[PDB]
Amino acid sequence: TTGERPFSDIITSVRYWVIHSITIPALFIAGWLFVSTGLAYDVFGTPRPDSYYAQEQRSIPLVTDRFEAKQQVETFLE
């Protein structure tokens, strides 16, 4: 009894569904594409399945230098 429209009124109204039958699927498709385009890997710097190791390297690219860690990751990525 704080004023706002009751949730049960909103989610059973035709107009809620007209707005949301477009916004909900649009958001979901945008999330889908953020991954399917590969963009998620690049924003966050997460390795793709082919990018954890070089072909013959077999030690992990562990960061070992506090202030030049950013440079280490850049060289590791080289």
Binding site: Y41, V43, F44, L62, F67, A69, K70, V73
Partner: protein
């Protein structure tokens, strides 16, 4: 209704679906960012560069194995600010260096401050005593001791817990093998307050539900109660007689009963927090010296205490090379402690 301060105060304190308050200005952004940083990291962010682990749905982990992991040991106790000297404003690199860890831990810390200020604020407006805020000091002591003090006493944030289901399981096992934390009387007091609290929760709920007054015709008894009713909904007298006769003692004072329900778990969590402050310094209850002196001189003397240290020794040697990659441990097969066959 005066100056802007008092107009702002009015609006902050409106009776709405989600109360805001002055505390809301700290709470909401901090809780939102802690939770969102957790969902963002577990969904998208690796721990390859800090731990050599995959840790996100993106890389293939499930709800049990995802985490936002701590930064590399080389980061020490860096605040690891986005604009700080490590990431220098590069968001991608900051994610790869474990910046989301300190982001979550610190927003989470300020958020808990805001939640507790919210408990005080709402209590003051509604005119109740602020015991809920007081009780919440136990969650606070636990968060601060385990997520801040513990790693501050150790070499780096690397050894804080990582924010994940399996990551936290790993943290428990590490504390067993390295700190023998089960032997610690402050942890034992925590366990008593948690299990004793769950005990009080169960027994008090069951007793009320089983000493109810027949206040309606329904065989489903929940409707036969009214919040504004003057009368107790259940019989303290009958409840007292039952437990006096079953167990030997019983509550007779409802006020004492409810205070004790605050006291037990709040006190147990505060005790566990003190033990963790000691573990920040490796100041463990690891050993009983008299046990070791006897066992060293008498190879036929064995107790469950000596059996558990053998397990700890296994945990340390088997887990350390992958759990502490900055150490570059190489332990040749021949040095690993193992019993026969296994």
């Amino acid at each position: 209704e005066r100056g802007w301060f008092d107009i702002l105060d009015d609006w902050l304190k409106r009776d709405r679906f989600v109360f805001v308050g002055w505390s809301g200005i700290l709470l909401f952004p901090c809780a939102y960012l802690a939770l969102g940083g957790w969902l963002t990291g577990t969904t998208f962010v690796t721990s390859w560069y800090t731990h050599g682990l995959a840790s996100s749905y993106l890389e293939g982990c499930n709800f049990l194995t995802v985490a936002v992991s701590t930064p590399a040991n080389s980061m020490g106790h860096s605040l690891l600010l986005l604009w700080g000297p490590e990431a220098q404003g590069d968001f991608t690199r900051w994610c790869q260096l474990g910046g989301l860890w300190t982001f979550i831990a610190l927003h989470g810390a300020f958020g808990l401050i805001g939640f507790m200020l919210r408990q005080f604020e709402i209590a003051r407006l509604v005119g109740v005593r602020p015991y809920n805020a007081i009780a919440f000091s136990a969650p606070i002591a636990v968060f601060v001791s385990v997520f801040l003090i513990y790693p501050l006493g150790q070499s780096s944030w690397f050894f804080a817990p990582s924010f994940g289901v399996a990551a936290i399981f790993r943290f428990l096992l590490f504390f067993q093998g390295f700190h023998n934390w089960t032997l610690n009387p402050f942890h034992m007091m925590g366990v008593a307050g948690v299990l004793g609290g769950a005990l009080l929760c169960a027994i008090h709920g069951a007793t009320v539900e089983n000493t109810l007054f027949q206040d309606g015709e329904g065989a489903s008894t929940f409707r036969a109660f009214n919040p504004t009713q003057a009368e107790e909904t259940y019989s303290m007298v009958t409840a007292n007689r039952f437990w006096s006769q079953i167990f030997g003692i019983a509550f007779s004072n409802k006020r004492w009963l409810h205070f004790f329900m605050l006291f037990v778990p709040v006190t147990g969590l505060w005790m566990s927090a003190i033990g963790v402050v000691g573990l920040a310094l490796n100041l463990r209850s690891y050993d009983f010296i008299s046990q070791e002196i006897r066992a060293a001189e008498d190879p036929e003397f064995e107790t469950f205490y000596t059996k558990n240290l053998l397990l700890n020794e296994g945990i340390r040697a088997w887990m350390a090379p992958q759990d502490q990659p900055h150490e570059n441990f190489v332990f040749p097969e021949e040095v690993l402690p193992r019993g026969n066959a296994l």
